[PDB]
Design a protein around this ligand. Sequence first.
Ligand SMILES: O=C1c2ccccc2C(=O)c2c1cc(S(=O)(=O)O)c(O)c2O
Ligand SMILES: O=C1c2ccccc2C(=O)c2c1cc(S(=O)(=O)O)c(O)c2O
Ligand SMILES: [Cl-]
Lengths: 237, 234
Amino acid sequence: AYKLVLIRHGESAWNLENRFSGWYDADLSPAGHEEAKRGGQALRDAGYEFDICFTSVQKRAIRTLWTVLDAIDQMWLPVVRTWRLNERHYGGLTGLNKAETAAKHGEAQVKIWRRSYDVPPPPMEPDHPFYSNISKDRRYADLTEDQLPSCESLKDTIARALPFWNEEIVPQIKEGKRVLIAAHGNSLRGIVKHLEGLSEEAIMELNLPTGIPIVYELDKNLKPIKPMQFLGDEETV
Amino acid sequence: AAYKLVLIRHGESAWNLENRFSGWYDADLSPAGHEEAKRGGQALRDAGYEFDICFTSVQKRAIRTLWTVLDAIDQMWLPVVRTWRLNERHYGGLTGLNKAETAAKHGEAQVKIWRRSYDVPPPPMEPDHPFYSNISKDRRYADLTEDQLPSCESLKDTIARALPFWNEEIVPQIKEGKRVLIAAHGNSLRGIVKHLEGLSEEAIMELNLPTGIPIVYELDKNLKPIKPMQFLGD
Ligand SMILES: O=C1c2ccccc2C(=O)c2c1cc(S(=O)(=O)O)c(O)c2O
Ligand SMILES: O=C1c2ccccc2C(=O)c2c1cc(S(=O)(=O)O)c(O)c2O
Ligand SMILES: [Cl-]
């Protein structure tokens, strides 16, 4: 009868969520911050309590979590950060808008990437404006060459998220700790795919809403007993 | 030096403006106290400081100070550890009372005694106290044993429960080469400074750490300061 809550961060600065923000450490926009506050207020109104929180090492997710903990008066909770919950690494496309992407690689190839589970985008090369910014960022200094991506397929992203789910999060849930996870579209996709046993095609069609608490009820095998539910006023739901 | 340690004491709280004893009551920062934390964070940013792990209490005036600093230095991704052992001194029955109410009920002499005493506690927070359930029954302390959860603390009590965390969880991290930031409260930080500098009870009671200001220690491999604490800023 466990309860798990997920929350996907909202809008980031400079329209970066429509520019393959990926591993670039974009902050929330004021709008994204307000979204997180609304999500937190929904959790507060519903009287939710947590015992432990997981998030990525990207400040838009961390700030989403902080906003939520502030709203629900549980700033004292233990918080665990991991690169394994980071957004998908969009490689050389990182920072580009739709037009720039199609101009550079063509519509055909974009259609293929968009629709593919196991094809990565091109690698982020040294001439990319974010190359040293991300690859030499001190928060990833303990990662091995194989762990630090230059690019990720969705398959890759899920593959590195799920070890953390199994090794760090599952044991807490089975101890009865009430878990909050604040993360990103694709890392949360990995979790949802695992929970609901979805196909590659289905998970690629699933777009989790932003700034809205997503509630799971899990049985003793960590299988959902019902569809995911969204928290908030009747309309927003 | 072999190691570098940074301490920061949170600034003004909402109850400081009311002249009320907070102790374990979870008062938030005032707007002013929050600004103090931003200025401290900007001083750490200007000085180019990097950390590897952060410790704070389970009280939001300290936690928010920490968040404010991490935001300022662009290190929100750092591991953060919270512990009740770094909480402010527990002021027992005085909790919630302002200066006037305290002197009215207990007299100037008794407040004078409590003020300057290292080892005399204030009266206990009893079950009929207005904040008794608010503090003593708060679920964040549910894992504390009976003897661990205080009804009141002398400064000696406070130091006594802070230093185990220092010895068992912070010291090992420093000797592992981790650059530590501690964001906490006047009296718990007093505990750390007292252990570090080998100060007397008298000296530690005369020590008032500035608020919102990074306090920098340079330590040898045995964690002995090699010079006086330094304050960071303009
Ligand atoms: O172009 C891409 C793309 C390119 C390279 C790697 C991954 C993706 C990708 O994942 C993607 C894309 C477009 C859309 S969109 O036009 O339908 O909004 C998506 O939804 C979407 O997920
Ligand atoms: O009233 C107190 C007090 C009351 C009860 C227990 C402890 C203290 C105490 O420790 C204290 C006090 C006042 C001052 S102050 O008025 O000089 O700012 C202090 O500096 C200070 O340390
Ligand atoms: Cl945190």
